[PDB]
Design a protein around this ligand. Sequence first.
Ligand code: HEC
Length: 251
Amino acid sequence: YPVFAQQNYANPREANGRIVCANCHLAQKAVEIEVPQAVLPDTVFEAVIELPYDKQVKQVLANGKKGDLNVGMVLILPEGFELAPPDRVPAEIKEKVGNLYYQPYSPEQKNILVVGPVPGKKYSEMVVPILSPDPAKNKNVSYLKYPIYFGGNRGRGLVYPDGKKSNNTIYNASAAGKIVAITALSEKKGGFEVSIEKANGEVVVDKIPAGPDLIVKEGQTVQADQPLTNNPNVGGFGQAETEIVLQNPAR
Ligand code: HEC
């Protein structure tokens, strides 16, 4: 979630240009962003974002069932740029944005907007209203060509802030040995327990939560770190760049 990024990285964009969502949403899926090639000072323009994905395909939910995906993003604008205030946003534009509540990454970083989690069904495409700055007032911005960084995500991440995996990833054998048994868990608890008899006869038991499907069976021998399930993840993260020129009016 965008809040996980806000709570674990002062700056969402790393030196090499990679966005921190990429530290937990490990699969890549293309995204697109579009802004006008140029804008006048203190003006309201729009950024249009695409977070494409097949909506017929469902993901593994936290509870282990299948279901809809949620989207979120981070928009890194130049110093000085900021979310357009409600009163400066055209009604036609207001309707386009919908019931979305963009927010600064931090109170001190008003040029970094985030949003989500929100339903992917209705927000596969998002419109963000930005207020261009004015160098004639702000010493920190000039009439240049500025870069714009974007990061969009679809689906539940594979790793939590504490470092543990979610149920939306590949599970591997904790040891090498023969699979002596595969017990399904409850009916409400879901998942399976895969008992592996090691060379020394000791039997370890790998717990696999509901979500991913098994690709092994009783009698099969596996190596340590060998995948026991498929890769359930159907979401993805993506980054895109663009740029905008901050025009200099001339009277
Ligand atoms: C690792 C510490 C993470 C960071 C950094 C970010 N996300 Fe994340 N995200 C993470 C997990 C483990 C999950 C699943 C949580 C759960 O309880 O199931 C998520 C989930 C989201 C979602 C929800 C999608 C859904 O289908 O429900 C969204 C839209 C999302 N994350 C977006 C997102 C963005 C844009 C981030 C960067 C700004 C980002 N996440 C970072 C783990 C982590």
